[PDB]
Structures are given as structure tokens and as C-alpha cells.
Write a protein that binds this ligand. Structure first.
Ligand SMILES: CCCCCCCCCCCCO[C@@H]1O[C@H](CO)[C@@H](O[C@H]2O[C@H](CO)[C@@H](O)[C@H](O)[C@H]2O)[C@H](O)[C@H]1O
Ligand SMILES: CCCCCCCCCCCCO[C@@H]1O[C@H](CO)[C@@H](O[C@H]2O[C@H](CO)[C@@H](O)[C@H](O)[C@H]2O)[C@H](O)[C@H]1O
Lengths: 472, 448
């Protein structure tokens, strides 16, 4: 199965591969590289050609033409130097930036790129085709990408998923003026941000500023994810909004503050931790709820999903969104396929339900996150089908006698039952349901309705064990 | 004015539809206007018109007033099949698709056949693999082939041929007449008459199926939403001919294979030369019409019960889409569609999303138009449910003439805010007026 790959993400694939080659202290055969990238051996060689020629003299790459290639750079340098070159060269990257940030006609854009219109227009058509799954379009006059504003911005941000930490794609926006504002938010929130995370929050601030400069602003938020206007994160952005409006001559209405605030909050997914997690959970919980409802509707498990099941769903969503604030993606490919072979129908179903969200959300869900959800839900199916019946032991004779009965029930039934040793505060249907009790075994009559009770003697008789057996 | 999403796999379809359009219109077409229909550069439009000059007979009326654009009307007694076929054979992507679905190959072997370097073929393969994800297909590496559900692979290939000419046969190892003979017998057995193109497209599908069976691939698994009843005439017709089919071609048809061919046969009869196949159609497609309605309703939440009449229209819409295989050329309606889309953009998108969650066998046939049809059809119910008034039963112990009189009084008061049920003592009734000639006391009571 060839991996489905697109011309928009070529630069992403090259960067990840280059990183892979370096981390591994081993030889890479041309056959093996051809297969990672999915290209002709001759194309693997054109790339090695650029690589060898663009390495700084500091690094060394070996090629004995029988065992393949080997790359080692010093531990103190980063891959930034070559990574940036890959980006500055990527033609399709430049076109996507043009189409999102700049004024052009077909002919004007063809000019900047030193291309014949008959060379550009097939590429544009392909790009228009590829982005349909993202709910975007390319309109013809002026020549630009269009769609829901937040979808357009995340698209750009996702194409920058693995940019180096010192790579700034906006020459017409001075970085420090964004950095000053972030330093200030970091201070107000009394948190410390990882370098990469921060850089990427700067990049998202600049994507947003550039759009506002071009006339483009958010005029519709779906409700599924809003930063509450009383949250520390909305308010911390609101604090810097005036300095930002004055540095760059833009206007941030409420819904832009909320968006940047969401960005802020997400970039703190990891920081070098309490009130953060809480805003995180309140903000994402409604999405976790819609996802769960979506999937349940197709899987028909019949379960009620409790709050800690939904908290894991927030966790997985968080892993998804954090990809913007961590440079390099870890692979897991074997792990993923094992999950996919074990639960193929469930895997596809969840893929479908995630793909019916907004692009803002499903842009971040790959096979791995889907495999995460797949395990999450299949775990419930096993627990609901295999968990033993929970039993509450009620006795007029006090707690020593309660325990003694409890051990007798266990001696007899082992794993067909689970004794609930906590003392129930009262006998209302709510107190029983919040201990998830299925069966009460009592030596006393009780005013209780909708839940099997087996009245037994103060020491169970064989008749008692027989009644209990039936309803277990 | 959004650029249309277009794929490299359907260039040949686009050029054939355009060539047909330039002919059928008795008016000029400017170069700019052709560039926009095809979403290509002027150099590229000009290059196509050059190829068109050179392959058109000089008998055929082809004008090029540079500044006015171009004009064409072929003689009424000749076919475009001539030029369309050249478009089909020239198309590289279509040949790669055919290779991928019908042949054994490796990368190096396929690049050999197409006289290309591997570094020119591989990007095209990646692009196709990327484009067919939404069809639930994939490309295997070894052997190099297209992969997915067998019904889906077949329909993929069938739709790449959506507008091939009536004599176009891309199967040099399947003897066309050997298939036509089998279809002819079925046409006799059902006592019906097919249109020529429809018949040709049913032979094509047969050849696709036969080519696939010989290459190892058969249908393992149905969806359930469309099977022909194993007691249905159509199934039995196919069962008649199956044995000779098998000894001719050296393939075995199990039950589900027969059922697929029976489906094709029945869809191809969608249109034919003038009652009974219509009833058989409805039976087979009604389960899908119910699935489509239930999925859409789940998202629109209109709260209605959809009647047998509403469903039957869904089935009509489905037929319109499935008929695209048995009608060569596609008429467009761009304006009409975008009007519908503007009037109901959220409903449009929801229906698009719902349809796209069916199997590819189905959603391959739904483009903007069919989505637009379903959108009206569902926004229509919304409007009925809301504006259609409350039904009333007049009951009086005074005779049927007092009953009529009081009924007419009410109508003369409230007009279309009510609707009288003239049938006698589950009949859609909400309100009961009963007791002798109403007064104001009675009237304001009836308002509420
Ligand atoms: C097999 C593993 C492969 C993974 C890693 C391989 C990717 C390596 C990235 C190579 C990118 C090199 O980035 C390099 O930048 C310099 C400028 O600084 C460009 O310099 C360019 O100048 C002009 C055009 O602008 C021309 O003379 C020529 O087209 C080019 O030399 C190179 O065209 C580009 O190749
Ligand atoms: C723009 C509006 C008009 C839309 C309609 C577009 C019309 C397009 C019609 C062109 C059909 C192509 O017609 C096809 O072209 C090539 C010429 O390139 C012909 O011939 C080709 O054959 C040999 C094969 O050995 C090639 O190596 C050679 O270079 C070429 O001449 C085909 O035999 C002919 O069938």
C-alpha cells in the first residue's frame, strides 16, 4: 500500500526524513530512501546531490556506493541550516503562501515564480483539488485560497508543522514585535514556554496578523471550541491587544482575541501546571463530547460515557493539537497497523466521524490519534461485556459481619462478582447508581425499588447461594 | 467564481464533454471562454485547437477567426466518435488507470510499456493514489495495482468511461460480439428493448467484470443496501446465460457475481424503449433511498415522517445519477445549481457530507446537480410541514347537510389556516369541532 502523499507536503516529508537519517546512527540504502519518499532511485540521487552540496563543511555525509549513505552532524548544531534551505526552495510552499497571504492574478503569480502560466495553472488546479477535503477553494479573481477563515489559517499553520525554531516565513512582519507580546503573556500567566512552542505561537500570531492586514477576519465561530471571555487566556490576550493593534495597525474584535487565546492555551499543552489543565479541559470538553456522541452513534455500544472516559478523549485531542508545538513527529507505524488489523471496522468508523468535524480539528488527526480512539472505545466494549456484577452487602449486624459475608461471597463466586466495600451514605436510586451497584445482598428488608435485592439469612444457606447464582 | 476541482484522471472526460458542447451550439467560442471551461492557459487552449485542426477532416466545418474565437459544426451524417476515440487513446492517465486495474506490472515494467522514465511515472502514480483515497481505493506497491473493494474498483473504471463513444471498445482480449450475443438473449428473455448506448455501456461493464474475474478478483462481500432479489426476473435472466458465459471466457460466477451483473442489467434498463422493470427498480433501490433519507434526517432534524411518495422521489434522484453510465453526454445547469446552493448552503453541504458517507459504488454518481435535487426535495418538506395547516373534523348530530354547511362557514372564516376532512367516521386529524350555528364565543375559541 503506497502511502497517499501530496505535493503540498513535500517539504514536510523531506524534513522529517532528513531528521530520521541523522537520529539513526546507521547506514541507509538507496532502495530504503526511495521507499520512504516514494520516488525513483534517480530522484533519491538528485536529493543526495543537493544534500552533499548544501551541508556546511562541519557535517559529514558518507556514500560508499555499495552500502548507501550515512549522515552525522555535530551534537551542538541543529538541522536548521539545511531544513531552511528545503523550505526556501519549495515551490508549492511558496504558491500556498502567495495564495493565502498575497494579491495576485494567475499572470502576476506566474511572473514572480518565473513560470509560464501553462506551468503554474496545472499546479494550481492540483492544489485546488487537494484542498477540497480541507473545505477550501481557490477562487480565480483575485487568485486566492478561500474558505472559513480559521480553516485557512490552520491550513497555513499545518504546512509549517515541522519548521525549525528559527525559521520565520514573514519578511513583512517583524518577529520581535510579536515576541515582546508573548513574553508579556508568559509573564502574566506565570508560565514558562518551550522554545519551539513559543516560536510556533509567534508564527500563528503572524499568520493571523497577516490575514487581518489583507482584510480577512473571523466572522463565525462554531461554538464547539471557544475560549470563555472570563478565562485567564482570553483576558491575557486582551491585555496585549492594544500594543498589537498599535504596532501593526490591525483591529482585533472579540472573536480574534478568542482565537489567539485558544492558540495561547494550546501552546501551553506543554510548558517547562494546574489552572492551565483546567482551562484546557473546559475549553476542549465540548469537542470531546461531540466526538464521543459522533462515534457512539455509529458504534452503538449502548454505554454511558463517564467523565473520565471523556477526559481521555480530551487527552487524545491534546496529543493531536500539540503537533503544532513540537517540531518532529514520532512514527509508531507498526503499533498503528496492529491496532488497525485488530479493529478495522472500528478504525474506519472513527476515521469517518472525525472527518465530519471541522478542518481545524481533523487536520490534526492522523492514523495514530485514530488508533488511540480505536483502543479507547474498544476497551469500553470489553469492560462493559466482561466486567463482573457489582454487589453491595447490607447487614444489620455491623461492619465485621459485613466483611465476613463479603469474603464468603468472594470464596464462592470469585470473578463473577465485585464487592463494593464502600459504605453507602443513603439508599436513594442516585447513591446506588453512583456506586454502579447491580445487586444488593441484604439480611434486612429495604425500601428500594429498581434494583435486584436478594434477602439472605445472616449466614448464607445453600438456597441463598442458589438465588444469588441465578441473577449473577 | 471558484475554480472547479479537477483531477488529472478525468481530463479525457472534460475534453470530450467540451468538444460535444462546442459542436451542439451554433455560435462562436472565444479562446478566453474555452480556457475557463477547461481551466487551462491560452497557450494550452491554442495547442488543443491545433490538434483539433489536424485530426478533423477538412470536410468538417471548423473556423478560426482569430479575435472571434472558434466555430464548429460537423456534418449531421458523421460522428464525433472519430475525434473522441483519438482523445481516449492519447490519454496517458487513462492508460495508466487501465494498466493499474487490469494488468500485472511493476514500476519498471509499466514505465517500460509507456516509454517513460520511472521518475516521470512515479509522481503520476502518487498523484493518482492520492486522488483515489476519497473513492476508498489504494495503490499496492507489489504487484503495482489498484486495490479496494471489488465493486468499487469496477465502478471506478466504469466512471472513467462515462462518455466514451458507442463504438469505443478498449478490450482487445475480449471479443465484443461475444458479449453482445449474451446481452441480446437477456433483452429477449425480459422482452424489452435497450437504447444503443445503454447496451454498449452494459457490454463494457460486462467486459470490466470479465477482465477482473480472469485476473483473480471477484466479489467477496456485498453491502446489503442493493442486492437484486434472487427471485427477481433480472437475477434469473443473468442466471440463464451464466453457463455459456463461463465456458466462453474461462471464469466462474458465484451468486454475488451474478447479482452484480443483474444489478447492472437492471440499471441499464433505467432507460429503455417504453411498467414492470420500474417496479423491479423501486424494490432494489428503495433500501438505499431509506438509508439516504435516514442519514440526512439525522443531520437536518426536520422531525418528519417521510412518506412512500417522498422516498420514491429519492429513488428518482438515485436513478438520475446511476443513468449517467447509460447516457453518453452530461448537460450541466451551472446557474440553476449555484442558485440552489445559495438559497440553502447549509442543507447542500449536509447532504454532500451524508452522500459521501455511503459506499463509492453510490457516491461516485452524485455530483453537484444530484445534491442540488436532494436539497430542494428536502427543503420542500420543510416548507410543507411548516406552512401546511391543521386538519379539522366537523362532527354534527344533525345530518350531512348541516355538516357541510358548518364546514363552509369555517372555510369562509379562516381560509387556508385550516383544512376540512370531508371523509366520514388515523386520518391525519388534529382538531374536532362539534356540539349548532357558531357565534363569536365559538369563533375566538376556534382561533386558538
Ligand atoms: C535522500 C535524503 C534527502 C533529504 C534531504 C535532502 C534535501 C536537501 C535540501 C537541498 C536544498 C538546497 O537549497 C539550495 O539553496 C540555494 C540558495 O541558498 C539554491 O541556489 C539556487 O540559486 C539559483 C536559483 O535561486 C540557481 O543558481 C540555482 O537554481 C540554485 O543553485 C539552490 O537551488 C538550493 O538547492
Ligand atoms: C479546445 C476545444 C477543443 C477541445 C477538443 C480537443 C481536441 C483534442 C483532439 C486531439 C486528439 C489527438 O489526436 C492524436 O494526436 C497525436 C498527435 O499529437 C496523433 O499521432 C501521434 O502518433 C504517434 C504514435 O507513434 C506519436 O508518436 C506522434 O508524435 C503523434 O503524431 C494521434 O494519432 C492522434 O489520434
Amino acid at each position: 500500500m503506497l502511502t497517499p502523499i501530496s505535493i503540498e507536503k513535500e517539504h514536510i516529508r523531506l524534513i522529517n526524513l532528513l531528521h530520521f537519517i541523522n537520529e539513526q546512527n546507521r547506514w541507509f540504502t538507496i532502495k530504503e530512501l526511495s521507499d520512504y519518499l516514494q520516488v525513483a532511485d534517480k530522484t533519491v540521487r538528485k536529493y543526495l546531490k543537493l544534500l552533499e552540496d548544501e551541508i556546511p563543511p562541519s557535517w559529514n555525509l558518507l556514500v560508499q556506493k555499495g552500502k548507501g549513505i550515512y549522515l552525522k552532524k555535530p551534537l551542538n548544531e541543529s538541522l536548521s541550516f539545511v531544513e531552511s534551505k528545503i523550505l526556501r526552495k519549495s515551490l508549492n510552499l511558496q504558491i500556498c503562501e502567495e495564495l493565502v497571504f498575497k494579491k495576485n492574478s494567475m499572470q502576476s503569480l506566474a511572473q514572480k515564480l518565473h513560470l509560464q502560466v501553462g506551468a503554474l495553472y496545472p499546479i494550481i488546479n492540483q492544489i485546488n483539488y487537494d484542498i477540497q477535503s480541507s473545505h477550501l477553494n481557490i477562487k480565480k479573481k483575485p487568485l486566492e485560497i478561500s474558505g472559513r477563515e480559521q480553516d485557512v489559517r490552520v491550513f497555513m499553520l499545518r504546512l509549517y508543522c515541522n519548521i525549525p525554531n528559527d525559521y520565520w516565513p514573514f519578511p513583512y512582519i517583524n518577529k520581535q514585535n510579536i515576541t515582546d507580546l508573548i513574553n508579556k503573556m508568559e509573564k502574566i500567566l506565570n508560565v514558562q514556554m518551550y522554545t519551539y512552542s513559543k516560536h510556533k505561537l509567534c508564527v500563528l500570531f503572524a499568520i493571523t496578523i497577516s490575514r487581518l492586514l489583507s482584510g480577512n477576519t473571523i466572522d463565525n465561530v462554531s461554538g464547539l471550541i471557544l475560549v470563555n471571555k472570563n478565562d485567564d487566556h482570553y483576558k491575557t490576550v486582551a491585555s496585549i491587544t492594544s500594543e498589537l493593534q498599535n504596532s501593526f495597525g490591525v483591529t482585533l474584535h472579540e472573536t480574534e482575541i478568542s482565537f489567539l487565546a485558544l492558540a495561547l492555551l494550546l501552546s501551553l499543552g506543554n510548558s517547562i501546571s494546574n489552572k492551565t489543565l483546567t482551562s484546557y479541559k473546559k475549553t476542549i470538553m465540548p469537542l470531546a463530547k461531540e466526538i464521543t456522541k459522533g462515534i457512539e452513534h455509529k458504534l452503538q455500544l449502548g454505554i454511558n460515557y463517564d467523565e473520565s472516559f471523556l477526559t481521555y478523549v480530551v487527552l487524545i485531542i491534546k496529543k493531536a493539537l500539540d503537533k503544532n508545538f513540537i517540531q518532529y513527529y514520532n512514527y509508531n507505524i507498526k503499533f498503528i497497523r496492529h491496532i488497525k488489523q485488530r479493529h478495522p471496522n472500528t478504525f474506519n468508523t472513527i476515521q469517518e466521524c472525525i472527518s465530519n468535524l471541522n478542518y481545524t480539528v481533523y487536520s490534526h488527526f492522523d492514523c495514530y490519534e485514530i488508533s488511540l480512539l480505536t483502543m479507547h472505545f474498544e476497551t469500553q466494549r470489553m469492560l462493559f461485556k466482561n466486567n463482573p456484577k457489582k454487589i453491595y452487602v447490607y447487614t444489620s449486624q455491623g461492619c465485621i459481619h459485613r466483611e465476613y459475608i463479603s469474603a464468603l461471597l468472594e470464596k464462592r463466586y470469585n470473578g463473577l462478582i465485585k464487592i463494593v466495600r464502600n459504605t453507602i451514605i443513603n439508599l436513594t436510586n442516585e447513591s446506588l447508581q453512583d456506586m454502579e451497584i447491580d445487586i444488593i445482598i441484604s439480611n434486612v428488608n429495604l425500601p428500594i425499588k429498581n434494583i435486584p435485592i436478594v434477602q439472605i439469612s445472616e449466614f448464607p444457606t445453600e438456597r441463598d447461594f442458589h438465588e444469588i447464582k441465578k441473577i449473577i
